[PDB]
Amino acid sequence: EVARAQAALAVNISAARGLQDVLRTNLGPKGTMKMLVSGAGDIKLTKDGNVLLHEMQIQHPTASLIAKVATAQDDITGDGTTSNVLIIGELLKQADLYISEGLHPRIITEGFEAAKEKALQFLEEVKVSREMDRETLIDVARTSLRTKVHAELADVLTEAVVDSILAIKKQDEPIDLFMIEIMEMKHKSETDTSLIRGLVLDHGARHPDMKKRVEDAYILTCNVSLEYEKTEVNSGFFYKSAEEREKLVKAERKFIEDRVKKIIELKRKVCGDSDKGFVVINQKGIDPFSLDALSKEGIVALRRAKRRNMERLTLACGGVALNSFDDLSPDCLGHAGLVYEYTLGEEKFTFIEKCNNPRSVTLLIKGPNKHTLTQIKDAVRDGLRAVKNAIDDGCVVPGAGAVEVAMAEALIKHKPSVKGRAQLGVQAFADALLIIPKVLAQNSGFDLQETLVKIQAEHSESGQLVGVDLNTGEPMVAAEVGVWDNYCVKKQLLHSCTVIATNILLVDEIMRAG
Amino acid sequence: MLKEGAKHFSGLEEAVYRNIQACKELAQTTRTAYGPNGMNKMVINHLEKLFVTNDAATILRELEVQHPAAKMIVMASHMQEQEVGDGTNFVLVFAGALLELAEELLRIGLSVSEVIEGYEIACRKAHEILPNLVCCSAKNLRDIDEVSSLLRTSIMSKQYGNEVFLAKLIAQACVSIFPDSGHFNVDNIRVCKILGSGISSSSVLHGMVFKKETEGDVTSVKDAKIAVYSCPFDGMITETKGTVLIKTAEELMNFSKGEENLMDAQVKAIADTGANVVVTGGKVADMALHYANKYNIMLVRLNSKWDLRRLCKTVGATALPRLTPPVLEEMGHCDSVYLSEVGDTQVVVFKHEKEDGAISTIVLRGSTDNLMDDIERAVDDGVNTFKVLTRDKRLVPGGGATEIELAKQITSYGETCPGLEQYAIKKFAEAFEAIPRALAENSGVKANEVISKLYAVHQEGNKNVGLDIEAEVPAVKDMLEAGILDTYLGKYWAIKLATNAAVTVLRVDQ
Amino acid sequence: VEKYQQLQKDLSKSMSGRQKLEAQLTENNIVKEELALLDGSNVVFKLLGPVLVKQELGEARATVGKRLDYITAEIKRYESQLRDLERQSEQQRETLAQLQQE
Amino acid sequence: RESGRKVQSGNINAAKTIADIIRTCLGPKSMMKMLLDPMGGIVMTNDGNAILREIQVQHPAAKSMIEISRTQDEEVGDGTTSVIILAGEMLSVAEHFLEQQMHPTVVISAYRKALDDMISTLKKISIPVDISDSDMMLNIINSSITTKAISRWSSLACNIALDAVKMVQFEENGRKEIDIKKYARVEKIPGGIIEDSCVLRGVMINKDVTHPRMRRYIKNPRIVLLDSSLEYKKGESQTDIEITREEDFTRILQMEEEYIQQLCEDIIQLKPDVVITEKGISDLAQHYLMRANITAIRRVRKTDNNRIARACGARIVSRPEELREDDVGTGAGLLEIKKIGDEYFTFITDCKDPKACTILLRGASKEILSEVERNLQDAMQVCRNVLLDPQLVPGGGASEMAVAHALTEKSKAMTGVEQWPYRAVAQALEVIPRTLIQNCGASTIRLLTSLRAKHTQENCETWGVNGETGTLVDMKELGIWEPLAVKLQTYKTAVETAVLLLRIDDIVS
């Protein structure tokens, strides 16, 4: 079929609206989490702009298009993405009128540009260079956390969030690459969350009391087993022919104690003293007697370790992954400043913590392991992006859309065009800005009206960035509030909202292709 | 939505209606299911078998709704049932009841957070004032009464009259063997239900009670090295050839004898590994039996996994099919491993006594399964309510003499704390009346009639509803002392728990 | 079981010597060529059975028209014994196996 | 079996319904069509060639419409969107009238006479270019890559193509074709930057060479293209039974090996260090070149070897006895297999072939190259259009409204029936400036009349409306330009199907 001209955009405008309504609170602590059945058929809860999109199976092309484009920004920030859907279709709701008044969507796409630039100009003029204080990091962390979860949940989790990034900036890494390791853990309540400067393995191998409490940890990560097999035929060697099986029966049990006593050597090679617990870590299993022959010597051998840990352990401890054991010095097997196998429930989760150059900080969350515990697994990594963004930009402003007004004010107050053609677009342009802070207030409390004419006159009074109190519905200084817009965060929505609106605002013929 | 996209079934009206309404659906019976309950519920479980109870969780897990609203909150009700044996009958009703104030406040037009947060701080205020209403504490597990006194409350919160012989029979199962200090175990004390005798013939044999026929002789030793096996007899006779027995006339000769010597070696290897009791979820065979009679290793003819499971659980046994010489890994645990006739049913009996690790095994002699399993249900959720793991349970009025105190506490205070939250704080003190109603439900009078008088009992902690007419006309039964209190904790969770999901399930418009 | 390959043997048995005949078939057409080009130059005996006999030319000729009856007869008959045995062999395969397994 | 007016209208209905948003797609200001799929795949594109394939074709004329768009897409690839524009117009505007006024032919005849009038008018308004000045070209090429709207990398692709196209410029039919594109050979290289990408004499062969192909660096020494007649003879001068068995190996290889010797010893005289065997390549052949003390190269595409016939610039010879530098591998030759990124690349330099440099393209990635690569493929089409036609003509309404008045005056001077086709054709022109005004966001009939006033006086010499700025403009001053050729061609093509669909009165089976 064909939805011609005005009809094609009438589809575009609509598909934006109802979803924007969902996200008027998906955003802020006021933001209401949303759940998904038909997205899978699973019981699924999520709060965030882009992920909920992908989670749902979204038949409508607009939403289908959006999940991809908001991604690129949701890649960066994670919050303001739950914001981003509003301004876009709202701008459609702006301009469609003008083309319903009659006009070219051309000149309005045109018109948005210089407004986008003055915004981009204003984005510079607004963005407040701020410091790297963990405090300054906390409020940027928690505002995204506050957006995505409860402020309490934001608060209690914020610390570990703004902590690891300090050690990942200890690497002088401008972003967060490692220390991104999150661990959900068996618990009655998601209340428990811990910050492990080192890593956590989940296993003690199968053998307790190996000297599993380890202060001096020289980390052997060995992807090869001490358990090849205890029976006749080798681990990968299978035989249904009789004479070939009698061949492997003798040395299969041996090549274990080959690798076993290599460690028993390697223990004394590393240590010479059972005093320092030497940590063997296996990506695969390890024989009980292997553990036994190791454990009694004080060797703590771990089996069935995870490849990311193997990666992490190699990196965090200055560790090593090994396909052989033999004998090596303590440092040839990277060092963890502390290692403790920690049993919660049945599983003993090895705390390998403050590894030498603890390049990977495991953030451990002990919870019901529901999607509720998954529901808090996002805001953190989301907030991680935010502080990473805050790490990225020293320039960060008040949140709660204090910029919106100060944008919408100046950008509109002056004609950046001193034209109709661009100002027409500019008019629509900076108007769709204010959607967020007013509706937040309007969702919180006081209507769009008062808060705006508050915050506008306030900004008009101020030039300070004054922004909504999301628990009141009238503005405050969001610099003082703590809800803080990273220039890295806030900038990209200006890119997206414009650049997406550009081509989608210009369509007339639409048809099934193929 | 309007657009072909947007997967969801929840939202907006259907949230402020159907979700809460679907939440309303299931709490309906939980009202009849908590406190003294004269009500009863037929259930077929996909056996088509009827069963009767007052408990929701047994039923609700079965029930399947489109909407996670029902699907979620049960987890909290489980989260209760996980931590606390009963009150789960209540844990659902309050939330569902407290919820529907919101949709009213939504018709009254109160915001999500606005409606939510009032309950929140009031819930904290509750969690603040809730321990202030601790009216007692438990004392001694060794004491049967000190235990049984409470235990009725949960059995009550399942079924009313039976609780008396039961609660005593429970601490007589020795809840006391465990300290209830950082430890307690069902599987050690596990209910074992003997169909037959009387239902009040339900007994206590400390140490395992296995209704399974106790074969061979009594165990070779009472310490018995216990090798439990899933199917150590798959048969040592093979099923092959023509008749699904034999084909050639020469076939039968080797079929019959082969079972013997294999089982002979098998049951010899039971003695060769040293297992002093043989447990076959696999079949019993008289030769193997006679071998188990020769080698004198007590035999178990058939096993539910529960047998194998507990044997795997308790003994440290491992049930494995052995067409294989048995090898003790299972080894022994229980210091006295017996044959017994309990209910005069052959009862496989293992016993070992330890402050922690002792099996003190509830043996229910009973006339009716359909009862004795629900009789099991209350004692289950009663001893699981005994599970607090505070020997002093910081008791509060049981059967809910609390709500009238708190329904007074909050909404009064609820106005003192100001702002539209106050109404959510004042709505917070309302759904307390649920069980006062839910009992007056099965008692048959008005909660208003109840609460008006039970507000007129004012600061009490004692007088409240129940069964009979003293929950009806006065609505006054002493739910501090009928002998009935409840732990602060199981109470403390329900508020805390039913705070969460209720708050939660509202937030979600998708 | 025994009934499987009892039939496939005499299947394979009369299969090959039959195919031996196919070589001899060309020869039995070539022996119609060789003897017909023998006018009695070289002494023609039939080789027919173990007695090697002083023979005449028509005895040589009429024999190989009768020797083609080897390739004629032995080849044809087996295509019976092929399926004559094959089917009873195929028949007995699933019957006795399913038994001893069942 | 469908026919006649209904088809004649359906032809329009088929053809015309396409161009609607497709004309808005014209110009950098463009309205992408959304193409959803029955699958649900969404497509935003201003380019018909993509749009044409993806859409359900409702009519065989649309099937025919595809043809001439593919034609121009094959013809040049520039203005493919524009070829279906005025084809419908001619039909759309007049057709129903003049067949109701009864004739296919009077319009059909008035297709040509309107056609050359533009061509005649073009060559006046199309004004020559400096190909001597690469920038006199480049500015158009820059105007062309800003038509492709990449001025970032492709402004270099401009030069690289231009520099190449000026070098791949040559050909002789005796009429001496200006460019030759089938000479032009790009490369696709990861590693290096496209700014470091260049063009060198002859055809660079990366096509068969991503790895060792002809040694590495063969400095002077020759590469030998083989169109022989090299097939190792099973006998001496005769072919005999193939080799199934030891005797056949012995006897025949006796006769085989000496023939490749008889052959590739005639190769060793031309001074190869490398011999690339396209024909006669067989187990013995290349085996003897290492015995002929020359590198042998196996089972290669003659496309290269023809490119290579433009690289060292030689011919290729089937002569078994006569194999030489002039026969194959002319010039001193430079055979250089360089690893640019991770891939070893034969560069055949020292071209003996007129001009003739071909394109090194090395991007830091394949992808960073590709953005240059496509517009460089576009610029060469542009450059050659400047080369084929060295008259730059002002883009848009300047070239548009100009011809119209001629056509009208033509029609008016003819004052027959065919006046109406020209009146249709002259008005058929005005769509694109209107479309550009449609595209820009201004009021066209004003700007149209305004542009008429631009012709009423100026004759719209350099004056169209400029769809970007949406104003009456000096396309000379703007530097808005284009070759007459693609202007002519795309237009001359737009005439053709209108001739077709008007000719065709019967759609049957």
Q: What HEC string does B269-309 produce?
A: HHHHHCCCEEEECCCCCHHHHHHHHHCCCEEECCCCHHHHH
Gap from A283 CA to chain D (nearest CA, Å): 34
Q: Which two tokens stand for residue D498?
A: 């209108």
| Inter-helix orientation angle A105-126/A81-100, to 10° | 140
Residues A218 and A277: their CA atoms lie apart, in Å, by 8
Residue B244 near chain C (CB below 8 Å): yes
Q: What are the respective helix, strand and coil percentages of chain A, to the nearest 5?
A: 50, 15, 35
Contacts of residue A445 in chain B, CB cutoff 8 Å?
A: 111
Residue count of chain A: 514
Pick the closest to residue B430 from B28, B5, B102 (CA basis). Answer: B102
Chain D residues with beta carbon closer than 8 angstroms to that of A60: none
Listed in sequence order, the residues at least 6 apart from A68 whose beta carbon sits closer than 8 Å to its beta carbon are: none
Place of tokens 């175990």: B185
Helix (H) or strand (E) holding B378: helix B369-386
Distance CA B400, CA B382 (A): 16
**A118 with A433: CB under 8 angstroms?**
no
Please report the sign of the dihedral spanned by the C-alpha atoms of residue A187, residue A190, residue A195, residue A200. positive
* Distance, CA of B228 to CA of B298 (rounded, Å): 11
Residue B428 in contact with residue B123, Cβ under 8 Å?
yes
Give the integer Cα–Cα distance in Å for D67 and D84.
10
**Does B71 contact A444 at a Cβ distance shorter than 8 Å?**
no
Q: What share of chain C is helix, strand, coil (3-state, %, to 5)?
A: 75, 0, 25
C99 neighbourhood in chain B, CB within 8 Å: 241-242, 247
Given a contact cutoff of 8 angstroms between Cβ atoms, the answer to whether B271 and B297 are in contact is: yes
- Active-site residue, A382 included: yes
The residues pairing with B226 across neighbouring beta strands, listed in sequence order, are B277
Nearest residue in B to C95, CA atom: B242
From A299, A307, A244, select the one nearest A276 (Cα to Cα).
Answer: A299
How far apart (Å, rounded) are the C-alpha atoms in residues B303 and B283?
9
State the nearest Cα–Cα gap between B334 and chain C, in angstroms: 43
B118, two tokens: 């009032």
Suggest the residue from C1, C3, C101, C102 to mutate for an interface test with chain B (most B CBs closer than 10 A). C102
Beta strands across the sheet bearing D334-340: D204-205, D343-349, D334-340, D217-218
Q: Give which of D16, D32, D34, D440 to mutate to test A binding, by max A Cβ within 10 Å.
A: D34
**B250 at the C interface (CB within 8 A)?**
no
Contacts of B130 (CB under 8 A, 6+ apart): B396, B402, B406, B488, B491, B492, B495
Catalogue the long-range contacts made by A408-414 (C-beta closer than 8 Å, 24 or more residues apart): A408/A433, A408/A434, A408/A456, A409/A456, A409/A459, A409/A460, A410/A118, A410/A122, A411/A115, A411/A118, A411/A119, A411/A122, A414/A118
| Residues A438/A452, Cβ–Cβ less than 8 Å | yes
A278-282 vs A300-302, strand pairing mode? parallel
Q: Which helix (H) or strand (E) holds C52?
A: none
Contacting residues of D for A61, CB less than 8 Å apart? 34, 36, 40, 42
Active site residue A314: no
Q: Which two tokens stand for residue A338?
A: 């502390």
Give the integer Cα–Cα distance in Å for A479 and A464. Answer: 9
C33, amino acid identity: E
Q: Where are the alpha helices (DSSP H) in D283-416?
A: 285-291, 302-309, 366-388, 397-414
> Residue B450 and residue B455: Cα distance in Å, rounded?
8
Q: Do A507 and D32 touch (CB under 8 A)?
A: yes
d(CA B254, CA B184): 52
Query: Which one from D327, D378, D493, D497 is the annotated catalytic residue?
Result: D378
Residues 6+ away with beta carbon under 8 Å from A49: A23, A26, A70, A74, A80, A81, A82, A83, A84, A85
User: Judging by DSSP bridges, how do beta strands D204-205 and A348-355 pair with one another?
Assistant: unpaired
| Cα atoms found within 13 Å of the Cα of residue D371, Cβ hemisphere only | 17
- Write the residue in B7, B71, B508 that is nearest to A57 by C-beta: B7
Chain A residues whose CB is inside 8 A of the D440 CB are: 104, 106-107
| Cβ-contact B202, B209 below 8 angstroms | no
CB–CB of B509 and A32 under 8 A?
yes
Closest Cα partner for A108 from A503, A414, A413?
Answer: A503
Q: Are B and A close enough to touch, i.e. 3+ CB pairs under 8 angstroms?
A: yes
Taking the C-alpha atoms of residue A496 and residue A514, their distance in angstroms, rounded to an integer, is 29
Residue type, A319: G
β-strand A192-196 against A182-186: which pairing, if any? unpaired
| A41 in a known ligand binding site | no
Q: What share of chain B is helix, strand, coil (3-state, %, to 5)?
A: 45, 10, 40
Separation CA A104–CA D31 (nearest Å): 11
Structural tokens at position A478: 């969001």
Choose the closest CB to D31 out of A59, A107, A506.
A506
CB neighbourhood size of A73 (10 A): 23
D497 is catalytic: no
What is the per-residue burial (b if ≥16 Cβ within 10 Å, else e) of A334-353? bbbbbbbbbeeeeebbbbbb
Burial of A401 (0-12, 13-18, 19+ CB in 10 A): buried
Nearest alpha-carbon partner for B271 in B325, B339, B307, B321: B325
What residues form DSSP beta bridges with A46? A34
Catalytic residue flag (residue A81): yes
Q: Are D and C neighbours with ≥3 CB pairs closer than 8 A?
A: no
By C-alpha distance, which of B109, B63, B313, B283 is closest to B208?
B313
Torsion angle of C-alpha atoms D131, D136, D138, D141, degrees rounded to 10: -90
- Which residues make Cβ contacts (< 8 Å) with residue A132, sequence separation at least 6? A169, A391, A394
- Distance (Å) of CA B215 to CA A391, B14, B207, B302: 73, 61, 18, 10
Report the neighbours of B using a cutoff of 3 or more CB pairs below 8 angstroms: A, C
How many residues in chain C? 102
Contacts of residue A491, Cβ cutoff 8 Å, sequence gap at least 6? A120, A123
Q: Which residues contact B291 (CB under 8 A, 6 or more apart)?
A: B263, B264, B266, B267, B268
Contacts of D81 in chain A (CB under 8 A): none
- How many Cβ atoms sit within 10 Å of the Cβ of residue A152? 12
Residues of A with CB under 8 A from a CB of D: 8, 59, 61, 64-65, 103-107, 110, 421, 503-504, 506-514
Say yes or no: D443 contacts chain A, CB-CB below 8 A. Answer: no
Sign of the C-alpha dihedral computed for residues D155, D156, D157 and D159 taken in this order: positive
The answer, for D29 touching chain A at a CB cutoff of 8 Å, is yes
- Residue A280's DSSP bridge partners are A220, A301
Task: Return the closest-CA partner of residue B221 out of B340, B125, B350, B129.
Answer: B350
Return all residues near D216 (Cβ < 8 A) that are at least 6 apart. Answer: D336, D337, D338, D344
Closest CA to B390 of B128, B141, B92, B169: B141
State the CB neighbour count (10 A cutoff) for residue B406: 22
φ/ψ (deg, to 5) at B365: -75, 135
Tokens of C99: 């038994």
Looking at the partner chain, which of B6, B113, B507 has a beta carbon nearest the beta carbon of A56? Answer: B6
* Residue B210 DSSP label: B
Is the minimum CB–CB distance between B61 and chain C shorter than 8 Å? no
From CA D238, how far away is CA D247, in angstroms rounded?
17
- SS3 state of residue D205: strand
Q: Which chain B residues have a beta carbon less than 8 Å from that of C100?
A: 240-242, 247
Q: What is the DSSP letter of D184?
A: -
Interface probe, candidates D13, D23, D36, chain A, greatest A C-beta count within 10 A? D36
For residue A13, give the chain B residue with the closest CA.
B3
Residues in contact with B345: Cβ distance below 8 Å, sequence separation at least 6, in sequence order: B194, B196, B211
- CA atoms of B170 and B145, how far apart (whole Å): 10
Q: Which residues pair with B44 in a beta bridge?
A: B50
Q: Six-digit token pair at A133? A: 């204080």
CA–CA dist D445, D26 (Å, integer)? 19
- The sign of the dihedral angle between the CA atoms of D191, D192, D198, D203 is negative
Q: Answer yes or no: are the C-beta atoms of D26 and D82 closer than 8 Å.
A: yes
D346-373 burial, b at 16+ Cβ within 10 Å, e below that, comes to bbbbbbbbeebbbbbbbbbeeeebbbbb
* Active-site residue, selected from the candidate residues D47, D163, D248, D505: D47
φ/ψ of residue D46, rounded to 5 = -100, 0
φ, ψ for residue A235, nearest 5 deg: -65, -50
> Do residues A458 and A409 touch, judged by C-beta distance below 8 A?
no
C-alpha A58/C-alpha A12 separation (Å) is 14
**How many other CB atoms are found less than 10 A from the CB of residue A254?**
11
Instruction: Annotate B77-113 with b (16+ C-beta within 10 A) or e (fewer).
Output: bbbbbebbbbbbbbbbbbbbbbbbbbbebbeeebbbb
Is A28 annotated as a binding-site member?
yes
Distance CA D75, CA D49 (A): 13
Q: Which of C1, C96, C100 to mutate to test the interface with B (most CBs of B within 10 A)?
A: C100
Count Cα neighbours of B169 within 13 Å in the Cβ-side half-sphere: 25
How far is residue A85's CA from residue A76's CA, in Å, rounded to a whole number? 16
For chain A, list residues whose CB is within 8 angstroms of any CB belonging to chain B: 14-15, 17-19, 22, 25, 29-30, 32-39, 43, 45, 52, 55-60, 62-64, 188, 368, 370, 443-445, 471
CA distance D479 to D239: 67
Give the nearest partner residue to B3 out of A34, A63, A188, using CB atoms.
A63
Beta-sheet pairing, A396-398 with D2-3: unpaired
Q: Are B32 and B59 in contact (CB under 8 A)?
A: no
Q: What is the DSSP string of A386-429?
A: HHHHHHH-SBEEE-TTHHHHHHHHHHHHS-SSSSSHHHHHHHHH
Proportion of chain D in helix, strand, coil states, percent, rounded to 5: 50, 15, 35
Residue in chain B lying closest to C96 (CA): B242
A400 is in an annotated binding site: yes
Of D165, D157, D201, D162, give the one whose Cα is nearest residue D181.
D165
Tell me, yes or no, if B241 comes closer than 8 A to chain C by beta carbon: yes
D200 contacts D357 by C-beta, under 8 angstroms: yes
Nearest to B41, CA basis, from B32, B444, B49: B32
Is D13:D107 a contact under the CB 8 Å cutoff? no
Picking from B61, A396, B463, the residue whose alpha carbon sits closest to that of residue B450 is: B463
Answer yes or no: do A18 and B509 touch at CB < 8 A: no
Mark the binding-site residues of B for ATP, compressed into ranges.
Answer: 87-89, 157-158, 399, 486, 491
Residue B397 near residue B485 (C-beta atoms within 8 A): yes
Question: Residue A199: phi, psi to the nearest 5?
Answer: -110, 180
What three-state secondary structure class fits A215?
coil
User: Cα separations (Å) of A4 from A7, A11, A24, D109?
Assistant: 5, 10, 31, 36
Q: Which helix (H) or strand (E) holds B70?
A: helix B68-83
Q: What backbone phi and psi angles, to 5 degrees, belong to D362? A: -125, 110
φ, ψ of residue A468 in degrees (nearest 5)? -55, 145
* Angstroms from B230 CA to nearest CA on chain C: 24
Reading the block at residue D397, the tokens are: 């309404």
**Nearest CA-CA partner of A220 in A164, A166, A272, A266:** A266
The three-point CA angle B442-B443-B444 to 5° equals 90
Q: Name the burial class of residue C80, with classes exposed (0-12), middle (13-18) and buried (19+) by CB atoms within 10 angstroms of its CB.
A: exposed
Residues 6+ apart with CB under 8 A from B20: B69, B96, B99, B100, B102, B103, B505, B506
In the set D81, D346, D349, D493, the catalytic residue is D81
Do A508 and D33 make contact, defined as CB atoms within 8 angstroms? yes
D368–chain A nearest CA distance, Å: 20
Longest dimension (CA), chain D: 93
